[PDB]
Amino acid sequence: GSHSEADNYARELKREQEEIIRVPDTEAAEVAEILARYGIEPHEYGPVVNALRKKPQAWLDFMMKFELGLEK
Amino acid sequence: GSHSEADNYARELKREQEEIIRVPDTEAAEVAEILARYGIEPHEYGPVVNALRKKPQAWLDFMMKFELGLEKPD
Ligand SMILES: [Co+2]
Ligand SMILES: [Co+2]
Ligand SMILES: [Co+2]
Ligand SMILES: [Zn+2]
Ligand SMILES: [Zn+2]
Ligand SMILES: [Zn+2]
Ligand SMILES: [Zn+2]
Q: Least crowded by CB within 10 Å, which of A40, A48, B20, B50?
């Protein structure tokens, strides 16, 4: 039986959104840590992390592409 | 036969660093176009571009991952 490239991503998209809902602060922290890898200081990344928090699908996209390294 | 040419990474790492030198402005508007996809606004991302420009090593690694979707190894 079949393993769609659709199924794997929807399987990962589910997990991640259940993660945004159940522990949203932890997920913000994951964005901080990715940006702070690039010597970007909290005063500089703070507002970007915040700006994602308010646009949950964009924030979800950003985990998907930049935390997990998967695409649509 | 069995392959040993410098991999995509090693290649794009050369091209990205040169771009950063020759047209830094364009590479800066590249970050804006990337962050802008996720609804971030200039007042939000402006300082992040501004921080990266002042750190060529950071800026190269950022473009690699965010523009080209490749990781620094080790
Ligand atoms: Co500062
Ligand atoms: Co570039
Ligand atoms: Co370029
Ligand atoms: Zn996750
Ligand atoms: Zn997580
Ligand atoms: Zn090869
Ligand atoms: Zn380039």
A: B50
Measure the CA–CA gap between A16 and A39, rounded to whole angstroms.
Answer: 26
In chain B, breaks (C-N over 2.5 A) are found after none
The amino acid sitting at A10 is A
Interface test with B, best of A33, A44, A61, A70 (most B CBs within 10 A): A44
What method was applied to determine this entry? Answer: X-ray
Q: Helices A42-53 and B42-53 meet at what angle, rounded to 10?
A: 150
Query: Helix, strand, or coil here: A62?
Result: helix
Q: Work out the minimum CA distance from B30 to partner chain A, whole angstroms.
A: 16
Q: How far is CA A14 from CA A9, A60, A61, in A?
A: 8, 10, 12
User: Do residues B9 and B30 make contact, with C-beta atoms less than 8 angstroms apart?
Assistant: no
Nearest to A54 by CA among B38, B45, B36, B34: B38
Mark which residues 4-63 of B lie under 8 Å from A by CB. 35, 37-41, 43-45, 47-48, 50-52, 55, 57-59, 61-62
The structure was resolved to a resolution in Å of 2.7
